Amino acid sequence: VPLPEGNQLFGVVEQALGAGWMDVRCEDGKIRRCRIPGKLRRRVWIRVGDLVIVQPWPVQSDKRGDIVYRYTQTQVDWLLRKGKITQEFLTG
Template sequence: MAKDEEPSLEERIARLRLPKDDEVFGVVEKALGSGHMKVRCEDGNSRTCRIPGKLRKRVWIRGDDVVIVDPWEVQSDEKGDIVYRYSQTQLGWLKKEGIWEEK
């Protein structure tokens, strides 16, 4: 890529974590305690999600945070795991690119 060329949308998106395969966007509605959250997902389901141990110690998740949810294979409409949380800067970028729209 030349110095004065604008990077393509695909190149800019490649730097940011997006949902893969069965994963969906979600918004944390409330904390239930013990590392569990109630999340309203983009596919219309409201899931009880847990924060896996590797995220629990590194990331602080609060209400109204935008997250990526990986639904469980069993009870996929009711339960899932939170695999990523977006910062406010990342969320602003997603809105600007038209990937995330507030509902």
């Protein structure tokens, strides 16, 4: 239901680097080493290959970012019906 705002955009989880760090491919072609904020790190489990909202850092907004929201399967289908996400983006 929430949508990206400003620098926020859609991303796909690619690899888990441990220590609360993730690898996420964005919808423009940049692989970013993102950090999981503690507020949502203690509530929601996240696996490899999920759609999330990536907010770039105010400094060096090219390789580092944060993950601020994750969607569910029903939300993924709803976005697919709306026309905001495509099969190519899911499959990379």
